[PDB]
Amino acid sequence: MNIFEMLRIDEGLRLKIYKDTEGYYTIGIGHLLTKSPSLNAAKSELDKAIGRNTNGVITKDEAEKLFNQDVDAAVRGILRNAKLKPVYDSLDAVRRAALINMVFQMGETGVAGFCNSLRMLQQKRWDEAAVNLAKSRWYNQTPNRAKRVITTFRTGTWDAYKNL
Ligand SMILES: *SCC1=CC(C)(C)N(O)C1(C)C
């Protein structure tokens, strides 16, 4: 297992524009198009991202290309962020994947708002981090995915993604 397989499990794959758990227009493997209520604005963003007249449908290779770009961007976003990089550097490879997952889902700004939990991760207090992480809108809104990520931070293994 690795970050790509992990996020593919958490986000799924859909080739036509859909609404994500928050109601925002999305396509592919969790690629947010816009927060705008307008389906046309979303179609516009899509064509702009793919570089062709898509009419809201994309192929599997287009979806995986957006996905490669988005993982790359999440990683570099962590490494340029002053709050996040020190945490990332302190973690082992499995736990780094959990941090990337969170950034991918909620963005740098969003994750940097978990200041108390991140300090606990840096200190390597895994059980205490896991409790703090669950006291969050994130956990209440997408509990099954949040449990998988939290379990990854607590154990440093892929067991939550095992047989999925
Ligand atoms: S969220 C900012 C932050 C606080 C502290 C726990 C000292 N950190 O290590 C970072 C920069 C993550």
Dihedral angle, C-alpha 157, 2, 6, 100, nearest 10 °: 90
Residue 79 structure tokens: 């490494």
User: Is 1-164 a CATH 1.10.540.10 domain?
Assistant: no
Q: Ligand 1: does its nearest atom lie under 6 Å from the Cβ of 87?
A: yes
**Tokens 């067991």 -> residue:** 159
Closest C-alpha among 107, 91, 87 to residue 155? 91
Closest C-alpha among 100, 94, 97, 98 to residue 156? 94
27: which strand partners?
31
Residue 33 structure tokens: 């198009």
Rounded distance from Cα 75 to ligand 1 centre (Å): 17
Resolution (A): 1.8
Query: Which value, in Å, is the radius of gyration of the alpha carbons in the chain?
Result: 16
Relative to the CA of 82, which ligand 1 atom is closest? 11
Give the C-alpha distances (Å, rounded to integers) separating 135 from 120, 127, 140, 155.
Answer: 14, 13, 8, 19
Experimental technique, in short, is X-ray
The domain spans of the chain are 1-164
Annotated binding site for substrate: 32, 104, 117, 132
Relative to the CA of 86, which ligand 1 atom is closest? 9
What is the C-alpha separation between 34 and 37, in angstroms, rounded? Answer: 8
Q: Ligand 1: does its nearest atom lie under 6 Å from the Cβ of 79?
A: no
Q: Ligand 1: does its nearest atom lie under 6 Å from the Cβ of 147?
A: no
Give the C-alpha distances (Å, rounded to integers) separating 109 from 30, 49, 68, 104, 144.
Answer: 18, 23, 21, 11, 22
Q: Which long-range contacts (CB under 8 A, 24 or more apart) does 136-140 make?
A: 138/102, 138/105, 138/106
